[PDB]
Design a protein around this ligand. Structure first.
Ligand SMILES: CCCCCCCCCCCCCCCCCC(=O)OC[C@H](COP(=O)([O-])OCC[N+](C)(C)C)OC(=O)CCCCCCCCCCCCCCCCC
Ligand SMILES: CCCCCCCCCCCCCCCCCC(=O)OC[C@H](COP(=O)([O-])OCC[N+](C)(C)C)OC(=O)CCCCCCCCCCCCCCCCC
Ligand SMILES: CCCCCCCCCCCCCCCCCC(=O)OC[C@H](COP(=O)([O-])OCC[N+](C)(C)C)OC(=O)CCCCCCCCCCCCCCCCC
Ligand SMILES: CCCCCCCCCCCCCCCCCC(=O)OC[C@H](COP(=O)([O-])OCC[N+](C)(C)C)OC(=O)CCCCCCCCCCCCCCCCC
Ligand SMILES: CCCCCCCCCCCCCCCCCC(=O)OC[C@H](COP(=O)([O-])OCC[N+](C)(C)C)OC(=O)CCCCCCCCCCCCCCCCC
Ligand SMILES: CCCCCCCCCCCCCCCCCC(=O)OC[C@H](COP(=O)(O)OCCN)OC(=O)CCCCCCCCCCCCCCCCC
Ligand SMILES: CCCCCCCCCCCCCCCC(=O)OC[C@H](COP(=O)(O)O)OC(=O)CCCCCCCCCCCCCCC
Lengths: 95, 300, 104, 118, 230, 62, 199
């Protein structure tokens, strides 16, 4: 047997994968308090850690890489078919 | 979004599936066999959820629940007839004394234990379709899944054959008390008419509901209601447009199950007057299968 | 026994087999009813008498004698000397084996 | 006509409000076949049919005109998702695929099972 | 003991007749669609053409045994037979004959002969080898005694159903008790040793080859009582 | 009957019983020959068009 | 001037058939495929249609006209698939085979397999048995075509004639006669639109 092509749908990158990185980009959990209190994030037993790279990060990165690889494979197939068409057209012309 | 879930659900599910399947296959008591089969199916459900197709998980749950319940009712009738002796080592030749139970158990078990051309084959097929391959312990996970899936045949065959069609092993009284000619009447039965009707209706409704769910989910037109989840696993790609690799890979498990069926059917463990004729029948079946395949594929 | 569009005239009827003294001989493939070459050991780690019996030694000696006589006939009916050398060598080997076996 | 596999008969793209109205399961909404799926769902709603009829009808009966577009879009979507159009070509002829690489990314790692040595 | 006749609405044998398919009872009446009734009624089958077709194109009475005493053809002009296998020998022959049709046919027909072989290998090694093949290899199709050689000729089924005969000295034959081999070959006797006799196993000390005799095999009283074997 | 997937993946695709229409028998002669050749060419071109369209349309969904 | 579409498609077919028209066959299957490709029909990229001009429409007796209109409808369906609705497409297609046909085929296969098994087991191979097997196989193959012919001649034929009459009333005989004529522009046929199709 050989490994199968599995991963997140290439049409749904904006979503489960998109939101995961969007949260770390926003870093909204360490914004200033709305009342002006000196307290903020990182001042509780449960606090945000936006500089973290462990946990499900590895799984998300693997899924994103697999989706990118599948998209690259599709693009290469499209280029191959276009090249074949061009070569056949050139061969027809050169006769 | 749980790293722990990703690592733990498939491994534990597959280990439980293998353990329960093998223990159920080797089990000798009806209730214990059903309990270990339930453990194996719970493991398969965990592995399906790890795959991440909630529709497949729901289908597996429905199939398992319905047919496990039906089989439990059948074995309950068998035990009540056998006077609370749940071990089939004292059960033999019950097909005639419990005619309805025999056929009901046949249908329920073939559906429950994933067997080809049965309503319960598709749940395991979809589980193997959706199984993920990025796991570090994927070798162990896959081997355990295969062993657990094949284990169903052994326990189903043992339960059905030993309970009903095996040589009479039970106490003489069990058969004699019911074989008296005075009991011969239109009302004669070792079970309840209400029990039979309930089992029949349960089986019919289970078939109908499973078909409805299969149409809702596995059909080309997806008509299931929203699952309120934004995680797409891409598993449906190998169910809609499978590739030659996976199509031939499934054949490995199919043929493993076929060989195990042949073993449980034609394998002789005790001397009998039909040993030579059984070997002859096996040879006839092999040669006829070969010729039939030849004609079907090439000669038409 | 069983056939379709066939005649079993040449088949041996079970009546003859049931009868005793039916004078029937069986010829089967890969049948070896003569023990020649069974106990012919070209090289012996020990005395042939220790390991083999008089019956085995006699079988081997008879086979060797027959082969040597046939090769002697070959010598008689052959003319070219160069081809005759191989026959002579084989005869000498057979004679040595026969001598050792007969001594044992 | 002459539209792409993702476009529908009317070449109409539904908005988010229209999708919410004709609520589409997330499974379909994730893919690119929302435009072709919505007309099929609308046709089914206008002409409700039993699940037995849906299973036993190979052309979806009344809702065949939209089902053609939906089936084409679904085939393209799944084929591109699983990269089956390239995998099948490599399976059919690995040597020729390497000779004129359809996709070097998949070719460099593809290895057909030893059992399938046709 | 039966009281069914005391009630007019009670079940009857006419009602139970439908169970004759699943229940074995002596015949009571012949239905219009039975094979016997159809053959005896339709005049077509009475035609001499059909009668002669039945008479010729089927198993012949010549091969049918006619006595409880069998004297198979002598293997050697001076030998006398002792043991012969009737049914298990034929079954083993037919089973091993499959290697001449299924195997080349499988190679020339199956799309994946390597897949077929990979499936067969473990199948042979478990539940098939000990099941049939080793028993067939050690099976004795026929046994005769040559007195001039004081030997015994044993016929065996080989690969592809080929039959081959081998000679063994009577002095080299020994009786191997089943207890000495049960533990060594439990699986063989577990799944494939039922056909042959467990307590009548012999072996050749020189060659270390066993001899399995079918339980339903014919033995010759004169052969057993011959002084060479006693 | 309706789900031969197991048979297909366990024994392969067996020979299919004949299934065709006798519409072509309406025309006869050179007309029939030319139309049959055109239909065969169209079928081959359609298969190739399907293959190339499947390969090219990878980027349709943006 | 521009590259010929038919020539380009023929070259692309020659180049890419190995991918989309290749399956896994055994040795016997490969030999049979080789025999078929030897006795095949070549893919003529260009067909010379300048020799057969036409036949006058008045010649036909209004029944050959209906038959030729049926053929024209088949050609239109083959070239452009959006012309006909689902029901019309089903009418034009061969009637799908049924349980009767499939069971007959598999019963034939079963009897043949049983006969071969019996012959091998009893070593009952001879000229008469081989001839019987050949004749039985030939008869079975001939019979397997009977259901399709019966379907086409009984059910589909009147339906196709009715559809042809409907389309003749809609368009006119000369339109489908022009379509039947091989000189009809295939590109125009592909781009043609159906008045009777709501689409
Ligand atoms: C003395 C009375 C005793 C009780 C009698 C009860 C009889 C029940 C008989 C039917 C039961 C089994 C139904 C099939 C199995 C389920 C199938 C399924 O999932 O549904 C699919 C289908 C659903 O429809 P569908 O699957 O065909 O698809 C619908 C299509 N779309 C979505 C487009 C609309 O449901 C059924 O077929 C089930 C029947 C319809 C529901 C009936 C509910 C009302 C019942 C009225 C009678 C009330 C009697 C009260 C008696 C009180 C006594 C105290
Ligand atoms: C990496 C390396 C891989 C290697 C893989 C190897 C795979 C291939 C293995 C090849 C095995 C070859 C087996 C040879 C069998 C014969 C052996 C032998 O001598 O036994 C004599 C045996 C026994 O001979 P005997 O002398 O004892 O007696 C003659 C026969 N009786 C016993 C009846 C009197 O005879 C036979 O079995 C004869 C068989 C003849 C037919 C053989 C071919 C049948 C299959 C044909 C092709 C498939 C069907 C095609 C149908 C087409 C229809 C249109
Ligand atoms: C190359 C070296 C020699 C190889 C010898 C062949 C293997 C040993 C002899 C096998 C004889 C049994 C053949 C049964 C064929 C049944 C039909 C079939 O599927 O054939 C095509 C297929 C293969 O044809 P294929 O390769 O064209 O199929 C397409 C590929 N698959 C199926 C994987 C998707 O046959 C098999 O798969 C056979 C596998 C090997 C079996 C090994 C022995 C176990 C079985 C015991 C005998 C009884 C089996 C009964 C089965 C009944 C149906 C489930
Ligand atoms: C080596 C190749 C790669 C694969 C590796 C794995 C090898 C196969 C391992 C099979 C293990 C099966 C264990 C079953 C245990 C059942 C116990 C039970 O209920 O009691 C016994 C029941 C019988 O129960 P019973 O109640 O009738 O009687 C029991 C009698 N006593 C207690 C005396 C034993 O069933 C059997 O007997 C069948 C099991 C034994 C035969 C096993 C044959 C295996 C064939 C393997 C084919 C492989 C095909 C190739 C592809 C494989 C990989 C994809
Ligand atoms: C009679 C009692 C004993 C029988 C025991 C069972 C014997 C099994 C022997 C297996 C040998 C090895 C496999 C070779 C045959 C493979 C067949 C196959 O894959 O075809 C699937 C095929 C695949 O067909 P398909 O792929 O062209 O498409 C089917 C789908 N439709 C209909 C929409 C086109 O499925 C069938 O339709 C099977 C036949 C169904 C109807 C049969 C009616 C009865 C026929 C007479 C009895 C035949 C008995 C023999 C077994 C029949 C099994 C279907
Ligand atoms: C001039 C006149 C000319 C006349 C020309 C026409 C003559 C008539 C031709 C047709 C009729 C032939 C004669 C009728 C009997 C045929 C018997 C047969 O085909 O073989 C049966 C065979 C029995 O087993 P066997 O090992 O051969 O044992 C020998 C016993 N004497 O069977 C076997 O080997 C076992 C095979 C089956 C293995 C298991 C599967 C069970 C189901 C098999 C069904 C086969 C029957 C067809 C049905 C198929 C669908 C189920
Ligand atoms: C890579 C190999 C793939 C498989 C090849 C199969 C070849 C089949 C033909 C074999 C012909 C020679 C047989 C020799 C017998 C003998 O005396 O063989 C005797 C010898 C010696 O055995 P010992 O060393 O134990 O004495 O056998 C061996 O050394 C092992 C070879 C085993 C051959 C088994 C053949 C049957 C295979 C059955 C497969 C499963 C069932 C299939 C459906 C029926």
């Amino acid at each position: 047997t050989t490994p199968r092509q599995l991963g997140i749908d290439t049409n749904d990158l904006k979503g489960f994968l998109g939101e995961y990185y969007g949260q770390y980009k926003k870093r909204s959990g360490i914004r200033s308090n709305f009342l002006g209190l000196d307290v903020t994030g990182e001042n509780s037993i449960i606090q945000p850690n936006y500089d973290r790279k462990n946990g499900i990060r590895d799984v998300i990165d693997s899924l994103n890489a697999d989706a990118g690889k599948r998209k690259l494979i599709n693009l290469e197939a499209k280029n191959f078919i276009e090249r074949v068409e061009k070569e056949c057209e050139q061969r027809i012309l050169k006769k | 979004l749980s790293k722990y879930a990703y690592f733990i659900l498939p491994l534990i599910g597959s280990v439980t599936a293998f353990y329960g399947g093998l223990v159920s296959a080797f089990q000798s008591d009806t209730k214990k066999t059903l309990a270990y089969s339930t453990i194996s199916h719970c493991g398969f459900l965990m592995v399906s959820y790890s795959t991440g197709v909630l529709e497949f998980v729901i289908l597996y749950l429905y199939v398992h629940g319905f047919f496990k319940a039906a089989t439990f009712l059948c074995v309950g009738n068998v035990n009540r007839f056998n006077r609370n002796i749940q071990d089939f080592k004292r059960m033999g030749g019950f097909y005639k004394y419990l005619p309805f139970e025999c056929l009901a158990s046949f249908v329920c078990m073939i559906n429950l234990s994933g067997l080809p051309l049965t309503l319960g084959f598709y749940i395991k097929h979809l589980l193997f379709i959706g199984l993920v391959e990025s796991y570090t312990l994927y070798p162990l996970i896959f081997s355990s899944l295969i062993l657990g899936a094949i284990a169903g045949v052994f326990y189903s065959y043992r339960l059905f054959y030993s309970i009903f069609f095996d040589t009479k092993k039970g106490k003489k009284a069990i058969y004699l008390q019911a074989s008296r000619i005075i009991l011969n009447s239109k009302f004669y039965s070792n079970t309840s008419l209400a029990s039979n009707l309930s089992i029949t209706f349960l089986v019919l409704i289970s078939y109908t509901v499973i078909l409805y769910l299969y149409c809702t989910t596995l059909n080309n037109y997806y008509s299931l209601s929203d699952l309120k989840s934004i995680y797409i696993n891409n598993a449906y790609s190998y169910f809609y447009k499978p590739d030659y690799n996976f199509l031939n890979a499934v054949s490995i498990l199919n043929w493993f199950v076929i060989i195990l069926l042949i073993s449980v059917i034609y394998l002789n463990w005790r001397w009998s007057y039909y040993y030579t004729k059984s070997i002859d029948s096996l040879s006839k079946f092999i040669l006829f299968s070969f010729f039939f395949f030849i004609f079907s594929k090439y000669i038409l | 026994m069983s056939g379709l569009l066939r005649n079993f005239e040449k088949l041996v009827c079970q009546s003859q087999l049931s009868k005793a003294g039916h004078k029937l001989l069986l010829r089967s493939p890969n049948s070896t009813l003569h023990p020649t070459a069974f106990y012919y050991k070209r090289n012996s780690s020990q005395r042939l008498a220790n390991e083999m019996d008089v019956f085995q030694l006699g079988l081997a000696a008879a086979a060797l004698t027959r082969q040597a006589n046939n090769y002697a006939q070959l010598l008689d009916q052959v003319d070219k000397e160069a081809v005759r050398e191989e026959v002579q060598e084989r005869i000498t080997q057979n004679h040595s084996d026969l001598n050792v076996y007969f001594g044992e | 006509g002459h539209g792409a596999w993702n476009e529908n008969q009317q070449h109409y793209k539904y908005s988010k409000e229209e999708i919410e109205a004709y609520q589409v399961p997330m499974r379909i909404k994730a893919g690119p076949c929302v435009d072709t799926y919505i007309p099929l769902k609308k046709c089914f709603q206008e002409n409700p049919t039993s699940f037995a009829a849906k299973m036993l009808d190979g052309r979806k009966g009344k809702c065949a005109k939209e089902f053609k577009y939906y089936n084409t879009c679904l085939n393209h979507w799944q084929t591109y998702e699983n990269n089956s159009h390239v995998t099948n070509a490599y399976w059919a002829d690995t040597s020729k695929a390497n000779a004129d690489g359809i996709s070097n990314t998949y070719g460099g790692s593809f290895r057909k099972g030893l059992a399938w040595l046709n | 003991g039966d009281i069914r006749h005391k009630f007019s609405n009670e079940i009857t044998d006419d009602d139970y007749d439908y169970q004759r398919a699943m229940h074995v009872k002596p015949p009571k009446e012949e239905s219009l669609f039975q094979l016997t009734n159809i053959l005896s009624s339709v005049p077509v089958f009475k035609t001499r053409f059909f009668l002669d077709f039945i008479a010729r194109n089927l198993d012949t009475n010549s091969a049918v045994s006619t006595s409880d005493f069998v004297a198979p053809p002598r293997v050697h002009e001076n030998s006398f037979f002792v043991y012969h296998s009737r049914e298990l020998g034929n079954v083993i022959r037919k089973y091993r004959s499959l290697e001449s049709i299924v195997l080349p046919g499988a190679l020339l027909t199956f799309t994946y002969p390597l897949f077929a072989a990979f499936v067969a290998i473990p199948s042979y090694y478990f539940m098939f080898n000990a099941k049939i093949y080793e028993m067939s290899r050690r099976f004795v199709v026929r046994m005769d005694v040559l007195p001039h050689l004081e030997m015994i000729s044993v016929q065996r089924i080989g690969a592809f159903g080929i039959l081959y005969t081998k000679l063994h000295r009577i002095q080299d034959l020994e009786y191997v008790p089943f207890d000495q081999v049960k533990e060594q070959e439990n699986y063989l006797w577990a799944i494939g040793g039922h056909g042959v006799d467990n307590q009548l196993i012999f072996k050749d000390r020189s060659t270390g080859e066993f001899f399995y005799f079918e339980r339903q095999g014919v033995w010759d009283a004169k052969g057993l009582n011959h002084p060479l074997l006693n | 009957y309706l789900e031969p997937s197991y048979f297909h993946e366990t024994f392969g695709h067996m020979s299919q019983p004949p299934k065709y229409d006798l519409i072509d028998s309406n025309i006869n002669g050179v007309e029939k020959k030319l139309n049959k050749q055109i239909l065969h060419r169209e079928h081959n071109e359609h298969k190739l068009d399907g293959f190339v369209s499947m390969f090219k349309g990878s980027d349709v969904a943006k | 001037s521009n590259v010929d579409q038919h020539e380009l498609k023929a070259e692309m077919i020659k180049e890419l058939s190995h991918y989309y028209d290749h399956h896994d066959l055994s040795l016997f299957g490969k030999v049979q495929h080789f025999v078929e490709h030897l006795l095949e029909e070549k893919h003529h990229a260009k067909i010379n249609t300048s020799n057969f001009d036409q036949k006058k429409l008045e010649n036909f007796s209004e029944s050959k006209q209906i038959s030729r209109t049926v053929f024209a409808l088949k050609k239109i369906k083959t070239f452009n698939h959006d012309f006909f609705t689902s029901e019309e497409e089903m009418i034009l297609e061969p009637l799908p085979l049924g349980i009767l046909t499939y069971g007959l085929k598999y019963a034939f296969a079963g009897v043949d397999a049983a006969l071969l098994t019996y012959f091998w087991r009893n070593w009952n191979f001879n000229v008469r048995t081989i001839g019987l097997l050949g004749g039985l196989v030939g008869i079975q193959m001939a019979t397997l075509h009977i259901p399709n012919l019966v379907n086409e001649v009984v059910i589909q034929t009147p339906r196709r004639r009715a559809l042809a009459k409907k389309y003749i009333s809609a368009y006119g005989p000369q339109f489908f006669h022009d379509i039947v004529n091989p000189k009809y522009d295939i590109e125009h046929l592909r781009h043609l639109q159906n008045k009777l199709n709501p689409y």
